[PDB]
Amino acid sequence: SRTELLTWLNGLLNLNYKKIEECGTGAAYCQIMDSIYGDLPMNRVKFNATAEYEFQTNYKILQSCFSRHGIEKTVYVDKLIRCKFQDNLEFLQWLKKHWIRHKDESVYDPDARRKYR
């Protein structure tokens, strides 16, 4: 559920999200992928974005990550970027599964990776 996922995400990345809709900015999605692959351009991810044009940048970074690593999963930016509940709920559900299956043994420091943003 949304509550179970949000709690998981907040603990994983040391975030304080209250609604699934907040994942629509694409920043959290990028960092979940960074925790798994560690080659995301975190400095260029607009982590605390408020303007849609900035969300667009996050999604292009996310899409580039999928392409670089040969991830076949679909990413419908047009649906997610509007911060709609259902679309983001579904994408986050898949991301958690991807994380479970691919996150290795190394420790991840979400705060340091974001330069404490």
Curated annotation (Swiss-Prot):
Gene Ontology cellular component? cytoplasmic microtubule; microtubule organizing center; microtubule plus-end; mitotic spindle; spindle midzone; spindle pole
Q: Which GO terms describe its biological process?
A: 2-micrometer plasmid partitioning; cell division; microtubule depolymerization; microtubule nucleation; mitotic sister chromatid cohesion; mitotic spindle orientation checkpoint signaling; negative regulation of microtubule depolymerization; nuclear migration along microtubule
* Sequence intervals crossing the membrane: none
The chain positions of domain Calponin-homology (CH) read 1-100
Keywords assigned: Acetylation, Cell cycle, Cell division, Cytoplasm, Cytoskeleton, Microtubule, Mitosis, Phosphoprotein
The disulfide bonds in this chain are none
Q: A single Gene Ontology molecular function, please?
A: microtubule plus-end binding
Cellular location(s): Cytoplasm, Cytoskeleton
Please tell me what else the database record remarks about this protein.
Answer: Present with 3630 molecules/cell in log phase SD medium.
Say which family it is in.
Belongs to the MAPRE family.
Role description: Binds microtubules.
- Put simply, this protein is called Protein BIM1
Q: What is the lineage of its organism?
A: Eukaryota, Fungi, Dikarya, Ascomycota, Saccharomycotina
